[model samples]
Target: MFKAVLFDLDGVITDTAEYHFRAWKALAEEIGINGVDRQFNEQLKGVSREDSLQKILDLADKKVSAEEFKELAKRKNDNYVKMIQDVSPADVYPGILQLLKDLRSNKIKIALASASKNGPFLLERMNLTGYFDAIADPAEVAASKPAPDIFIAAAHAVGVAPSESIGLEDSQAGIQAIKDSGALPIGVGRPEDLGDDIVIVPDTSHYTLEFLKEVWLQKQK
Candidate 1:
């Protein structure tokens, strides 16, 4: 059975995607670029702000000097952090907190394994920081998802072996990272979106302890 659960933020923990998109959109507007939308944001999912900014620049067919890009990225983060200041415990997706609670009561360690350095900020805002045994804070790993560095670090921080941990993620890159870390990847979106090879948990409502235990038992089988 899996001894630990590593969860990604954004889609898994809360609904930050729209807020993040708004920040990205605001940045695009500041750059005098038109037509930046969710379609563009979708491509930047599970990536770093630096990577996302590069994609946005590519989308608008614009380029900036390294220093200019650095400043712009900072501006974008400022906007995003400001916008997310309103996120509260009420913002947590229904049923998810109970999942975390049950896991803790059962003594199953849980860790936040997110790429966003905003993990701590958002968790604090949501008042859910205490639930996690450890956090592989955002920007801790120089490499992002699909590299497994974050999840590996998370498992290590929680003192759990990768093979005994399960990763819950909502993006292809995240799922790939979980797999690379030797944890069973429990994807939080559509099977099609995450690829058919991954185990799909449609949403928080479906990711009950029973669901996780089933997967854990099956894995050992």
Candidate 2:
């Protein structure tokens, strides 16, 4: 049986990606960067504001003083924070509430392994602060997704071996990280987008504790 369940922040539990996309897109427009489409937002997903700005600067092929980068990152953070201040329980993804309650009913530890610096804040705003037993501090990890650091940290926080945990993720890098951490990667997207031969749910609505537990049992076999 699984001892713990780990979650990715943005697309897994909720859609904070919208706020990030909007805030970053606004900044890109203000800085006169053209063709900043969905692909651009995808590149910036789950990254820090500084990294996001760096990608934008690379796209624009422009450079500014070190102090300028700080200000720009700060501005985007402020905007994103403001946008999410009113988030509530309703903001949580469909079926997620039931899944969390089911996990609680079954005594499974829940930990967050998301890359977002605002992970705890978003959970707090969504009235989900009590559900998580631990949240891996992304800053403490030297590497991001596709490196297994964050997922491993989450498993450590919950005192569970990585192999005994299930990591719920939506992105390819996140899935790869979970695999590398020795945890079962329960992908939240299409297998084509995640990887082949992984347990994939089309979305949270397709997820249930029973179904996931069955998947875990099958994997064990």
Candidate 3:
């Protein structure tokens, strides 16, 4: 059985992707930059703010000083946070609460592994801060998704081995991180976007405590 479960926050636990996309797009437009399209937004998923800004700069073929980059990132974050202010418990993905309750009842450790520094605030707003034992956000990590740093940190924080943990992610970068960390990776959507080891659920509503328990038992063997 898995000793711990590491969850990705944005698209997995909450439907916050639209806010991030809108914020980034607005920032790009304000900066006279173009090409902050859907593809660009998808690429930004599960990436650190610094890295994502650098990517935008690359796409724009524009160079900015460190201070400028920081300022832009901060402005984008401000917009995103403001947009999420209206989010409530009703916005949480279906079945997530029950999943947390079941996991806690089973004595399984839970950790939030997200690239966004604002993850804690969002969790608190969604009334989910009490569900996780620890959080490894990019602001607290040296590296971001696809690097294994956040996942490794999360497992360590929860005092569990990577092999004994399961990571549920909604983005390809997140799935890569879990795979690099040697943990079982479960994808919440778009099975084609992830590797074979990643299990895809239609949505949070499709997930259940019993379904995860079966996955755990099968993985054990």
Candidate 4:
């Protein structure tokens, strides 16, 4: 019943959020932000590096000069990329390998829709580069999630009509964007956390093709 599946790059596919947390925490500490704790990493999920930097700044009621902003963002990403050097195929979440294979096996287009500029390399590092038909291109959008642009781009990339696809995401912004794109939003987290609009799956463990098809078709009722 679904023509395509759009996967989010980070927490949904792998725990690269660990690397991101480390990088963001390091930068947060360096900037003298008090209490740069794990809970704060919640703000960084599914958000762009620039937007994340802005989030951190907002925490401190602080602002940087245009030049300092770029410098900090670059520094954070440099650390993030460095920390991902050790990630491998083993890092992929449970059922992901078989799930991607099954989708392609059944002629379901697979697309990667993410806000990360590092997404392409991260997939390569995870040895998952062969799975997706299209990874989001940076130049395609003026704004990121909470705007349907990225998910819409992914749908078009795979030759599927907007509503013919399903977007798997773990963040509220991503869920909103997917919904706005006319695709079903499958939340990879909790309802209270991601809002009540999308179907909530605890994680990819439940993201099977059978489940997607069954739940999607059932929801159509």
State which candidate has the highest lDDT: 4
TM-scores of the models, in the given order?
0.92, 0.90, 0.92, 0.94
> Each candidate's lDDT (Cα)?
0.84, 0.84, 0.83, 0.85
Comparing 2 and 4 by lDDT, which wins?
Answer: 4
Regarding TM-score, does 2 or 4 come out ahead?
4
lDDT of 3 by residue, 1-221 (tens): 78988989888898887678788888888888877897667778888877777777887655888899889999988888789887888889998988999999999999999888888888988899999999975676667788898999999999999889988888878888988998887778765555466578878776676887777677532
User: Residue by residue across 49-132, what tens digits does model 1's lDDT show?
Assistant: 888888788866557899999999999898889989999999997667998998998898999998887889999999899999
Superposition error at 114 for model 2 (Å): 1.7
**Model 3, residue 25: C-alpha shift (Å):** 1.3
Model 4 lDDT tens row, 114-139: 98888899899888999999987855
In candidate 2, the residue pairs with backbone N, CA or C atoms under 3 Å apart (3 or more residues apart, or in different chains) clash, namely none
Worst 10 residues of 1 by lDDT: 34-43
RMSD vs true structure, all candidates: 1.8, 2.0, 1.8, 1.6
Candidate 2: residue 190 lDDT (0-100)? 60
List ranges where model 4 is wrong by over 4 Å: none
Off by over 4 Å in 3: 195-197, 219-221
Better of 1 and 2 by lDDT: 2
